[PDB]
């Protein structure tokens, strides 16, 4: 049993609620939060600048820490950084943006990453301004994610429907 509550469950692994991740993971806590991250681990915008804003930038300044030793991710790479205030750790996955040309067989690989971790809140990888179709996103991650994960769509309208479109 876990604290996840209002989801739909898609699958035996996959269940989806419309919420918006920062106010889901204040509530919950949970063990990991995966960030809709880029290779640089900019958080301007989308998931990533909202989740870095509800950190008070704190996530920034330890990304910024991170690049400066590590270098940058890979499309379709990630790392474990802290959660802050949101949850214990922070998955950053980079899905590809389709907005800067990147290839969409690159998302299966982003989903791959969730596999290292037994229960997950996320967004769908490469969807929002990555420029990805959601429904293409939900699907490659109900085929490819076998732990358990918990997504959180901010937008009603698609939350209804990549509900009614899922197969």
Not at 16 to 36: F, G, L, Q, R, Y
Not at 56 to 63: F, K, L, T
Not at 67 to 79: D, E, F, Q, R
């Amino acid at each position: 049993v876990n604290s996840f509550s209002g989801y739909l469950k898609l699958t035996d692994n996959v269940y989806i609620k419309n919420a918006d991740i920062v106010e889901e993971a204040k509530k919950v806590k949970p063990t990991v939060v995966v960030n809709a991250a880029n290779v640089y681990l900019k958080h301007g915008g989308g998931v990533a600048g909202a989740l870095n804003k509800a950190t008070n930038n704190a996530m920034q300044v330890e990304s910024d820490d991170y690049i400066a030793t590590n270098g940058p991710l890979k499309v379709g790479g990630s790392c474990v950084l802290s959660g802050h205030n949101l949850a214990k750790h922070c998955l950053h996955v980079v899905g590809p943006n389709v907005n800067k040309g990147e290839d969409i067989q690159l998302l299966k690989s982003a989903y791959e990453n969730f596999n290292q971790h037994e229960v997950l809140l996320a967004p769908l990888l490469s969807a929002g301004i990555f420029g990805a179709d959601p429904i293409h996103s939900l699907r490659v991650c109900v085929d490819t994610v076998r732990t358990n994960v918990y997504l959180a769509v901010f937008d009603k309208n698609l939350y209804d429907k990549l509900v009614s479109s899922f197969l």
